[PDB]
Structure 1
Amino acid sequence: SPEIKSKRRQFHQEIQSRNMRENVKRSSVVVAAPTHIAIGILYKRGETPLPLVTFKYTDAQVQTVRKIAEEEGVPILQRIPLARALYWDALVDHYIPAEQIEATAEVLRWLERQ
């Protein structure tokens, strides 16, 4: 149900016990809405049968994510609709939602070319 999904999102967010640098470092790429949202994505073919959302940070935390990503060599992409969609619907430390498969694959095709 949408209500249970909401409970799961909140819970999996709260149970996470990682600091920001650790979360950025363990990601493959960060998708961001500048000054608003940063979402970490882990995908290793694999390793990971699907991409996983590793973190969500918002507002001023995004600047800090950008800084750490540059330090740790993790690429950050501006992908406003994807970042918003993952923010609303993804569970942290779970595979990406079905609805974001196409958009996430597009990001990861980009990452593969780097």
Structure 2
Amino acid sequence: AHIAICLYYKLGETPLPLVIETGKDAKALQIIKLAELYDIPVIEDIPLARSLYKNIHKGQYITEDFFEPVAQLIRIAIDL
């Protein structure tokens, strides 16, 4: 019912956006908690969260299908 996907990107350190953490239900809520604790942007994107969850594992860099949408997610998150 509830998904959260945590992406990490730092220029010159992560070659691509990295899914560092994922969570469903209780752990999804925890992540969206902890993201508010540390002031990390949370964006609701149902199709992107669901496809990332189904395709990209924890600890895995995003694949080619996700480059454009995650680029846009990150730009939107940047400011905010």
Q: TM-score range by the shorter chain?
A: 0.7 to 0.9
3-state secondary structure, aligned to 2:69: helix
Q: Paired residues, what number? A: 80
Displacement of 1:80 after TM fit? 0.8
In structure 2, the partner of 1:83 is: 49
Amino acid at match of 1:55: E
- The runs of at least 4 aligned residues of structure 1 exceeding 3 Å deviation read none
Displacement of 1:60 after TM fit? 2.4
The unaligned stretches of length 5 or more in structure 2 are: none
> RMSD of aligned C-alpha atoms?
1.4
**TM-score, normalization: structure 1?**
0.64
The unaligned stretches of length 5 or more in structure 1 are: 1-34
Which has more strand, going by share of residues? 2
Amino acid at match of 2:57: L
Displacement of 1:113 after TM fit? 2.8
Asked if residue 100 in structure 1 is aligned to residue 66 in structure 2, the reply is yes
Amino acid at match of 1:38: A
Displacement of 1:88 after TM fit? 0.7
| Larger relative contact order (Cα-Cα within 8 Å, sequence gap ≥ 6) | 2
Amino acid at match of 2:13: E
- Cα deviation digits, residues 11-49 of structure 1 (max 9, x gap): xxxxxxxxxxxxxxxxxxxxxxxx510001000112111
Contact 1:85 1:100 in 2 (8 A): no
Amino acid at match of 2:44: Q
